[PDB]
Subunit: 219 residues, 6 copies
């Protein structure tokens, strides 16, 4: 990653064994549960494109997903190249060349180039641009591997309302509902999918009940 040291210059630091192992283990334990994504982003704080490739390449399973991710990265790289074409022909001696999509993705750029871009004044933030593409891909994977429609999350007859609400919003998160819908689903599908006893209680609460109030009501 690129870090400020103790004396305020941005320099390269090797990726730590602790970081490498954290990432491999979270993928082993959680697969593509949605909360793996913010974990990736956090563990990749300050990453160069080289570091992001290290993290992705250290994954041993899930090669269908990793191939889908390669496809998404190629699409974003191709769109970058449409927006920001680069001068063909020889670079100015000693000067910084402009990054192409594959340079951002770390496949045709050196670590030194990456460092140069990222520590330029002002920085050409190749690590952050690539990380956005990766996360775009990972979010597709999450949605793909979500095993259950929100329509099929219904409260069982002796299921505690809290355990049902947990299943409901765990499902909405993987299915990738916007916050609008998450905020909104509470006046609607959450009540619809509730068991008959709790449904009666919730119907009687009136509109504009908070989730807290719904949860208390069906406790």
């Amino acid at each position: 990653p690129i870090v400020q040291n103790l004396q305020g210059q941005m320099v390269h630091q090797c990726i730590s064994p602790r970081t490498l192992n954290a990432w491999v283990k979270v993928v082993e334990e959680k697969a593509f549960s949605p909360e793996v994504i913010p974990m990736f982003s956090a563990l990749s704080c300050g990453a160069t494109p080289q570091d992001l490739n290290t993290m992705l390449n250290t994954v041993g399973g899930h090669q269908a997903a990793m191939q889908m991710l390669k496809e998404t990265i190629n699409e974003e790289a191709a769109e970058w190249d449409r927006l920001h074409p680069v001068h063909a022909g020889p670079i100015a001696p000693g000067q910084m060349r402009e990054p192409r999509g594959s340079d951002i993705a770390g496949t045709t750029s050196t670590l030194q180039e990456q460092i140069g871009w990222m520590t330029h004044n002002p920085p050409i933030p190749v690590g952050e641009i690539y990380k956005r593409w990766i996360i775009l891909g990972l979010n597709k994977i999450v949605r793909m591997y979500s095993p259950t429609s929100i329509l099929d999350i219904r409260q069982g007859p002796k299921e505690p309302f809290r355990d049902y609400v947990d299943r409901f919003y765990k499902t909405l998160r993987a299915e990738q509902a916007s916050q609008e819908v998450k905020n909104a689903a509470t006046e609607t599908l959450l009540v619809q999918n509730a068991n008959p006893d709790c449904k009666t209680i919730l119907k009687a609460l009136g509109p504009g009940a908070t989730l807290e109030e719904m949860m208390t009501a069906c406790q």
Copy 2:
């Protein structure tokens, strides 16, 4: 987080793998037992709003709770915006803009903005303001998930008085009794809910017995 380095300037540092894993594990092991809250506060020492969102987003279960927390944060954000409206229209070139509620919550502000606010002279402590909102929400969650009324904590006939007192104050903590009440419950409900043998001994101690003295008396 924002830390002073070895040479006394406040700078950003990535959230550590050790911190990320500590938080995920304490939620996995303890859920919303009350002592998770001071753990959160401690693990979030110096956090930016981005870091606080990382911590909350890395939680995989408990999505009912996390949706209730979103609701509490939205309420606090809305109250901030009432108290501190911001100038609409274009920002002064190169200057610091005033944070809105959603900026404090990290959803409409960049890391750079956050850093700017937090390291301003004097600091606009967006991390500490957001952390207060989060803890307000978490405390509601704790109270919600408290499974037992203090009225139902009674000493069993062969229950050691110490084990009963532990249950009693463990319950009062989750139910969120003030210190007044915790201090006070010792002249009252603690004795009432004691078994007949210990109740007789405690009644005879007189008023103004310390808990230590009550515990010794029923040993």
Copy 3:
């Protein structure tokens, strides 16, 4: 905690995940065995009052003990306030206010105030003053939870003398005997409570035998 950095100024540093977890685990594994106290003191090296409260608040069980500790802290705070009353009315602009008992305990003082006191020249050592109160309380707890009188530690007929001596001094430590008594118990109760065979051997050694010599004699 407050630490000197690499360049010799005293500054605040966040409490580490390693420290937080060490403390929670030692309480989980050892409860209020006497050796938990020096562990607390060591893990709280350099602590602010905020940090000491973090450590105490992160404890999830033992709430009878934690309520007894609150009582002891309140008593010490009240005695501080007797000895060191503070000027009522407004503080001098920009100047340091004098700490009250509850300020020392971290309940009515900010982290900034604490830092100010602790790094004043000369330091008003609020962390060390509070830590003394806490340890006073913890020592009472240890004594309370000591399950066995020294009178009841007697060597079994086929109990190795070393295993008996271990039980004896493990008991004296929890019961909180002074070093005088620990030094002294060797000419007396240790021999009295020894089995008939070893008692004869020890009686014959004469007075002024070291523990080493007693242990060798009954090997």
Copy 4:
């Protein structure tokens, strides 16, 4: 390794216990699965030739592989020596000598020499040159230990299409297919090797289907 310190000079630092153990454990757990290679590269960030030899020598099993790797390194060393012969006869007093293949491999050069080369202006990057040779060898090992031809990866009749795709691309990775082929295999062998039901669905999608679209279609 050679690291920049806190003040921006490149200096030698001992290999850490954490690094040493990470590498030994990944070889113990994963053998020569392809993802061990990017792990090696990452754990060897900044390594001297001495450090790379340490890592290879700390491996206890797999001695057939380690002997094959020695053979590959000897071949690369011999090709270096063809391209870059060195002046025989005595070195200039106090001056840097030119590295031979065995110097790059760390077998005839001292740590001091290595440091000298690597921190020269401009650096003679002996660590990076050796690491390339090692990785060339490791890639051969991976290919050797790949147990299954891509021709034999066929979707079972009740095998989820995702689990088949995972096996397929896990195999292609060990067999060391180029990205061209990985990108391409999706219009061809992946469909051919699919079970009859999914094969019909994929045939009907048309050419130019993404893997994402194929995966959705056979869900």
Copy 5:
């Protein structure tokens, strides 16, 4: 401990959680096996008397041993006081007082005093003086808890000579034989205590056989 920082002044640093836990665990796992002593010395590198007391006080079992150790420390303290009596009466304002035995042992000296002594020019090395006393005591404990005489280590009839030699020198180490005797025991008791078959082979080797040669001969 007292450490040099990054800029070459000797300053105090808190004892680490890793150090505290290492020591507690080695005592839990190994008791007073001889190799615990060099572990203690190493884990106490740079320790103040306060730190050494922390380490000893964090031990929960073995209180017979810890009482024997207190006795040894008191004896060494008393001998220090004989050799180095201190001026009674008031200290020179602002000046360093001379340490008494109990000051060296950390029981009547503050951390500040200790730091003062240890960082004086030239240092009055109270940490190293106390550590020597402690190790003197620990060595007595080791010898006490050694369960087997060297006379009783004899090679069994189907015992591999190497396993017998391991038992032999493991015993000599706990029994605290000098290196002279360890060096010497090889021409004598080691052969005597060997089984009849190996004894014949060793007798025939001649005098002045190395242990290596004896071990090869009885392989």
Copy 6:
């Protein structure tokens, strides 16, 4: 160890708990398998003679080996003393004395002396000299504890050729064959000791087959 700090002076640093535990555990788990030696060398990076003795002394088992190692160190010390006799009689005030063998081994030299030698300009590298003696001894131990002759490593009739090659070169490593022999054994003993089926295939390959080619041929 002696390390450069953040500002480029060589100073002493305590041996870490992580290093101490790494070494004890590798000896516990691997005994004197050959790969323990490069682990020792790596974990002892920068070590003083004191540190090397710490590492050796922290080993609890294997006392036959540790006594053999003492013998080897004494032999090397005696040869050093032959090559580099020291001036008897009093040292020049304030000046550096010349190290004797036992000084190099850390038994008659202080840490301060060691530091002085190792940080002299130019360094008298006592740590590296002692480490060479130790490794000489450890290599003898490895060879001693090698349980199997290379003559007895033969491919079983249904043993995969790769598993046989692993046994073969694992044996050659412990038996301490030179690289010449390891390189060479491939045209000879490896084929001889192969099972009849693979032997026929290898005989037919011709001379000058690489190990890779032999392994492929018998796959």
